[PDB]
Amino acid sequence: MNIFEMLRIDEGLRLKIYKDTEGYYTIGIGHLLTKSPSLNAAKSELDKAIGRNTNGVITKDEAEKLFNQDVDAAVRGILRNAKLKPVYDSLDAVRRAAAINMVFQMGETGVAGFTNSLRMLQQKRWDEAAVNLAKSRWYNQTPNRAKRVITTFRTGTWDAYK
Ligand SMILES: [Cl-]
Ligand SMILES: [Cl-]
Ligand SMILES: [Kr]
Ligand SMILES: [Kr]
């Protein structure tokens, strides 16, 4: 397993615009198009992202390309965030994948707000962090996914994903 497979499991793959868990226009492997309620808006951003007139539909290859860019950007965002970087650099490879997952889902900003959880992770107090991480909107809104990522920081293995 790795970050790509992990996220492909959590996000799914849809080739037509769809609404995510928050009701936002998305396509592909969890590629958020816009927070606006306008479908036209969404179509416009899609076309812009892909470079053609898509008419709200994309190919598998195009979804994968957006996915690669999105992972890449998620990593670079962590490395660029003064609050995130130190934590991320202190983690083992498995746990780093979990941190990327969170960033991809809620943004760097969003993650950067888990102050207490971050320090616990940095200190390697796994169970404690796991408990603190679940005390969140994130966890109450998408509990199964949250549980998978949480177990991953807890154990440092991919068990949640097998
Ligand atoms: Cl884009
Ligand atoms: Cl979920
Ligand atoms: Kr992180
Ligand atoms: Kr976190």
> Method of determination?
X-ray
- Atom 1 (ligand 4) nearest CA: 118
- Active-site positions read 11, 20
Q: Has 132 been labeled as part of a binding site?
A: yes
Q: Is the CB of 153 under 6 A from ligand 4?
A: no
Q: Domains, the chain, ranges and CATH?
A: 1-162 (1.10.530.40)
- Tokens standing for residue 141: 């809104």
Resolution in A: 1.9
Q: Has 104 been labeled as part of a binding site?
A: yes
Evaluate whether 106 touches 138 at the Cβ level (below 8 Å): yes
54 vs 130: CA distance, rounded Å:
42
DSSP bridge partners of 46: none
Q: Would you call 13 helix, strand, or coil by DSSP?
A: coil
78 vs 106: CA distance, rounded Å:
12
- Alpha carbon of 103 to those of 10, 39, 112, 135, 149: distances in Å? 13, 25, 9, 17, 11
